[PDB]
């Protein structure tokens, strides 16, 4: 079974004019969204003004229009890369109010992804973090137990809030300096493993609460050097899979012409012995102990170009000279006065304007199995991938036993765009035909999330009114079924009124959420007695047990010293913090202080916490004495 994981660039929605709606998600199993960032000292971004940093800008993390970030944000927090594009921008006919986008971050690209998953109900969404520009703080965050925890907890909250199915870590690169000013340490090797364990544990906890199986992945470096600075074998066992970046092996940072993503060893390549080609890199990974089913092969939807390059061997493996601007790289598709020359071409741009056009001639290396363009007149050389080379790579994926293909990125395929119109065959259709056999046409298999925070809104001798937090689904939640002994009820909203009940009777109500395809959540329950200050709240809940909280308010004309809470609860409580359980009889409970919780002022509140087993009930007949 094969995977197709596509990268969506946040910034594609501006000049490149590639919107979420444009995406045909029948051709994907997974969509990675690039990028989110790490908060540090109240800002995020990379402030380095070194020339290898393409985005020398930082932003404050505190954002009044984003509920999760409407506060002083602590160090290590996962934060939105660009709030306007990510959650603030309003999209026409989406159903969003002004308040939803303006103060609740329910709009933007994340809103569009929610609509996309509904349209294509097999699709799983991942938030990618870091990347080349925003990897400056991973080392700092991973070096301390406290910032690893903050990061892992923020990741779980991010996923829940904005509807992602997992997180992808793109740390470029542990223990090595990429952009001067960025943090990196040798202990990054042990600390990268600790971070992934800390994230995985957090995701497992939350997946049990939520009824989801959350995914964890990384994007890793295709070199022995990356292997030498990480514990690949260990991390392969923690992750769902590894997106190996088997591209950018060579480009306009070097003075010899070469291939961006060569598949096999070409001995005629001066750099053959560095293993900077696909099969070399896979051999590096397998030799480290990485199972080949844990690798998803990266492929590029772009090419790389040098501006002035020697004429022998049709431009291949020749010396290159810089231009008037001092750079070796040619003027790529999206390059302008502010970017300078980056040598990066969308495949679309190449196919519409460069392949056997404008003086560029296509040649084929039948050893490396990749194409390249050379213009004898200008001296410009371009390494790229096409449908022919893509078909060789899909054959490799199937023969070597890799588990899929990842590609960078969605907007670079043959499309019509503000700067080119390509009408020829699409790289992505090659990946689909070759790895899946054809577009995916599957039904919803993803169940809705578990019901939470069941409360009794009102109670009667013969009736009860229940409310709960609405569950979520990828397509939508159609109804809730409530059971108690022999009886059954249902509702299309997250509340119900139940009538015709025996007075002074104990009932245990189990609630599950359904979707249209017929999936369902796992039951959650609450115990209620019909009729004839301490407020009890449930902080976290898996099936078997839950964490709780009690706030004790003093409405007194005196201070409360050595307080003792007495109440009855038709349920079992196991552990209490900031408190001790004095006694129990027929679900009646006596609780006492921890000695430094003795004093509660009149109008003051003492807050204590505990855990329980089974399902929650209602704290009743409470007294403070
Ligand atoms: Ca579903």
Numbering used by the authors: 40 to 571, 582 to 674
Copy out sentences from the published article reporting this entry, exactly as the authors wrote them.
Chitinases are secreted by many prokaryotes and eukaryotes and are utilized for hydrolysis of chitin (a homopolymer of N-acetyl-D-glucosamine, GlcNAc), a rich ubiquitous nutrient resource. Most bacterial chitinases belong to the GH 18 family (GH-18), and share a TIM-barrel fold in their catalytic subunit, have a conserved DxDxE motif, and employ a substrate-assisted catalytic mechanism. In particular, ChiA74, a chitinase synthesized by a Mexican strain of B. thuringiensis subsp. kenyae, has been shown to synergize the insecticidal activity of Cry proteins, and to generate chitin-oligosaccharides with antimicrobial activity. Our data demonstrate that this enzyme has a modular arrangement formed by four domains: (i) the catalytic region with an (α/β)8-TIM-barrel as a core structure, (ii) the chitinase insertion domain as a barrel insertion, (iii) the fibronectin type III and (iv) a chitin binding domain.
ChiA74 crystallized in space group P 1 21 1. The structure was refined to 2.26 Å resolution with a final Rwork and Rfree of 23.9% and 25.3%, respectively. Residues from the CBD showed poor electron density that may indicate its high flexibility. The catalytic region is composed of 442 residues and forms a substrate binding cleft and a semi-closed tunnel-shaped active site, with both the (α/β)8-TIM-barrel and the CID, similar to other chitinases with CID, the substrate binding groove is partially closed. Three disulfide bonds between residues C78-C100, C140-C146, and C453-C461 are located in the TIM-barrel, with an additional one formed between residues C348-C359 in the CID domain. The CID-loop 1 together with the TIM-barrel loop 2 (residues 74 to 147) assemble into a structure that partially closes the substrate binding groove. A calcium ion is highly coordinated by residues D483 and E485 (witin the FnIII linker loop), residues D512 and N513 (within the FnIII loop 2 which harbors residues 508 to 516) and D554 (within the FnIII loop 6, residues 554 to 562); these loops are the linkers between β strands of the domain, i. e. loop 2 links β strand 2 to 3, and loop 6 links β strand 6 to 7. In our structure, the FnIII-like domain is linked to the TIM-barrel through residues 476 to 484 at the opposite site of the catalytic region, defined as FnIII linker loop. Residues W137, W123, Y53, and W50 are located on the extended surface at the entrance to the catalytic cleft in ChiA74, suggesting that this chitinase works as processive chitinases towards the non-reducing end of chitin41 predominantly releasing disaccharides and also monosaccharides at +1 and +2 subsites, as it was recently observed with purified ChiA7422. In ChiA74 this motif harbors the following amino acids: D207, D209, and the catalytic E21121.
